[PDB]
């Protein structure tokens, strides 16, 4: 086997010419040449068997990726792992190599309104399919949006994804959260576990604001600072939106803050299309129940040039609602990846 840093990357002889790309929420990503299909691919190494939580996430990610089939969601080409459970310590997931991501593009490239409109359409088209499968991505951000040389957009890393569970979304004030800080909806910091579809819509809204200016709209430096950045632009929540927050600690925190008025979108983004700002406003709504849904967002006049509900497919087999030990999860990961084995 070949080494990349100080770690084994056992994908050869089919996959050679390894180069380090980076990391997902977990796992090490490399580019490689597929000697069989004569194309360069991306490969993610996952070593989750020593921990239950890692095993659960690895199992969900693989189950989700294998079940999903959509143009705006990157699929799995192959899975490399040992032929036996005893010999299996690592899992390698193979996907088509995408040229870049929206994070890298936004660092140095100004987006035309046409590119913003097209990227947003593709994000929401992929998201419609994800949400139709009763799945939440939960870590949408520019680095999880891959692009090729013709601007085809594909959503990646379902490492923090979960089956939607709105009945168990309520939690206490200041509950620790796993997903990337800057794209976290205000309710995460107040009373939400991020188990509802509205959590992904907030993240897409943050991505849209970022595509308009090439800078994250809410760059919180720590947990509560993230909420301060959000209220600094949306302004103080209304009495109606506060009445929706039953948790006393979360409500009293918001009531203790000095009153802030709404910063108009047309002042933050003076060169933006007015329809894009109307959609931005509806995605970046404080109250998650009033926040626009993915199908409504696709039907928004800003996306009129692309909107075609018959060419925005939904999932054929949605997921249903776990606490199994890591040894039983290793067996399920082994079973889930069995179809990619040489004998199969
Ligand atoms: N998780 C994850 C991934 C990514 N997360 C983002 C990593 N990124 C690295 C650069 C700095 C910001 C964070 S990317 C990824 C993947 C899949 C297909 N093509 C590419 N291409 C790509 C992405 C980034 C840079 C680059 O040179 C190429 N990546 C994957 C991936 C690769 C193989 C299998 C699976 Cl299940 C996922």
From Swiss-Prot:
EC number: 2.7.11.24
Domain comment, as recorded: The TXY motif contains the threonine and tyrosine residues whose phosphorylation activates the MAP kinases.
DNA-binding interval(s): 249-267
Disease annotated for this entry: Noonan syndrome 13: A form of Noonan syndrome, a disease characterized by short stature, facial dysmorphic features such as hypertelorism, a downward eyeslant and low-set posteriorly rotated ears, and a high incidence of congenital heart defects and hypertrophic cardiomyopathy. Other features can include a short neck with webbing or redundancy of skin, deafness, motor delay, variable intellectual deficits, multiple skeletal defects, cryptorchidism, and bleeding diathesis.
Residue positions where Phosphothreonine is found in the record: 175, 180
Motif (Cytoplasmic retention motif): 308-312
Organism: Homo sapiens (Human)
Residues of the Protein kinase domain: 15-303
BP GO terms, sorted: apoptotic process; B cell receptor signaling pathway; Bergmann glial cell differentiation; cardiac neural crest cell development involved in heart development; caveolin-mediated endocytosis; cell surface receptor signaling pathway; cellular response to amino acid starvation; cellular response to tumor necrosis factor
PTM field: Phosphorylated upon KIT and FLT3 signaling. Dually phosphorylated on Thr-175 and Tyr-177, which activates the enzyme. Undergoes regulatory phosphorylation on additional residues such as Ser-236 and Ser-238 in the kinase insert domain (KID) These phosphorylations, which are probably mediated by more than one kinase, are important for binding of MAPK1/ERK2 to importin-7 (IPO7) and its nuclear translocation. In addition, autophosphorylation of Thr-180 was shown to affect the subcellular localization of MAPK1/ERK2 as well. Ligand-activated ALK induces tyrosine phosphorylation. ISGylated.
Catalytic residues of the enzyme: 139 (proton acceptor)
Name of the molecule in the record: Mitogen-activated protein kinase 1
Residues with the Phosphoserine modification: 19, 236, 238, 274
TM segment ranges: none
Cofactor(s) the record lists: Mg(2+)
Activity regulation, free text: Phosphorylated by MAP2K1/MEK1 and MAP2K2/MEK2 on Thr-175 and Tyr-177 in response to external stimuli like insulin or NGF. Both phosphorylations are required for activity. This phosphorylation causes dramatic conformational changes, which enable full activation and interaction of MAPK1/ERK2 with its substrates. Phosphorylation on Ser-19 by SGK1 results in its activation by enhancing its interaction with MAP2K1/MEK1 and MAP2K2/MEK2. Dephosphorylated and inactivated by DUSP1, DUSP3, DUSP6 and DUSP9. Inactivated by pyrimidylpyrrole inhibitors.
GO molecular function: ATP binding; DNA binding; identical protein binding; MAP kinase activity; phosphatase binding; phosphotyrosine residue binding; protein serine kinase activity; protein serine/threonine kinase activity
Compartment(s): Cytoplasm, Cytoskeleton, Spindle; Nucleus; Cytoplasm, Cytoskeleton, Microtubule organizing center, Centrosome; Cytoplasm
Motif (TXY): 175-177
Family membership: Belongs to the protein kinase superfamily. CMGC Ser/Thr protein kinase family. MAP kinase subfamily.
Record GO cellular component, one term: azurophil granule lumen
Keyword field: Acetylation, Apoptosis, ATP-binding, Cell cycle, Cell junction, Cytoplasm, Cytoskeleton, Disease variant, DNA-binding, Host-virus interaction, Kinase, Membrane, Nucleotide-binding, Nucleus, Phosphoprotein, Repressor, Serine/threonine-protein kinase, Transcription, Transcription regulation, Transferase, Ubl conjugation
Job description of the protein: Serine/threonine kinase which acts as an essential component of the MAP kinase signal transduction pathway. MAPK1/ERK2 and MAPK3/ERK1 are the 2 MAPKs which play an important role in the MAPK/ERK cascade. They participate also in a signaling cascade initiated by activated KIT and KITLG/SCF. Depending on the cellular context, the MAPK/ERK cascade mediates diverse biological functions such as cell growth, adhesion, survival and differentiation through the regulation of transcription, translation, cytoskeletal rearrangements.
Positions where Phosphotyrosine occurs in the chain: 177
Superkingdom, taxonomy of origin: Eukaryota
């Amino acid at each position: 086997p070949e080494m990349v840093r100080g770690q084994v990357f056992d994908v050869g002889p089919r996959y050679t010419n390894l180069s380090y790309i980076g990391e997902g929420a977990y796992g090490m990503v490399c580019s490689a040449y597929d000697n069989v299909n004569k194309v360069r691919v991306a490969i993610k190494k996952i070593s989750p068997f020593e921990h239950q939580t890692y095993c659960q996430r690895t199992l969900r990610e693989i189950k989700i990726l294998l079940r999903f089939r959509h143009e705006n969601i990157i699929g799995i080409n192959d899975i490399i792992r040992a032929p036996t459970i005893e010999q299996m310590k690592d899992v390698y997931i193979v996907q088509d190599l995408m040229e870049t991501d929206l994070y890298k593009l936004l660092k140095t490239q100004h987006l035309s309104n046409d590119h913003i409109c097209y990227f947003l359409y593709q994000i929401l088209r992929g998201l419609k399919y994800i949400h139709s499968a009763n799945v939440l991505h939960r870590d949408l951000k520019p680095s999880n949006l891959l692009l090729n040389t013709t601007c085809d957009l594909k959503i990646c890393d379902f490492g923090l994804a979960r089956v939607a569970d709105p009945d168990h979304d309520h939690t206490g004030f200041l509950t620790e959260y796993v997903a990337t800080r800057w794209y976290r909806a205000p309710e995460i910091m107040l009373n939400s576990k991020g188990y509802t579809k509205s959590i992904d819509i907030w993240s897409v809204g943050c991505i849209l604001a970022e595509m308009l200016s090439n800078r994250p709209i809410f760059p919180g430096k720590h947990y509560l600072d993230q909420l301060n950045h959000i209220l600094g632009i949306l302004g103080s929540p209304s009495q109606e939106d506060l009445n929706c927050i039953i948790n006393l600690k979360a409500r009293n925190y918001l009531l203790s803050l000095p009153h802030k008025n709404k910063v108009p979108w047309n002042r933050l983004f003076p060169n933006a299309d007015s329809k894009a700002l109307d959609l931005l406003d509806k995605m970046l709504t404080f109250n998650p129940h009033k926040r626009i849904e993915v199908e409504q967002a696709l039907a928004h006049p800003y996306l009129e040039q692309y909107y075609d509900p018959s060419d925005e497919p939904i999932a054929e087999a949605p997921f249903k609602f776990d606490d199994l030990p890591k040894e039983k999860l290793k067996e399920l990961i082994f079973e889930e990846t069995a179809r990619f084995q040489p004998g199969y």
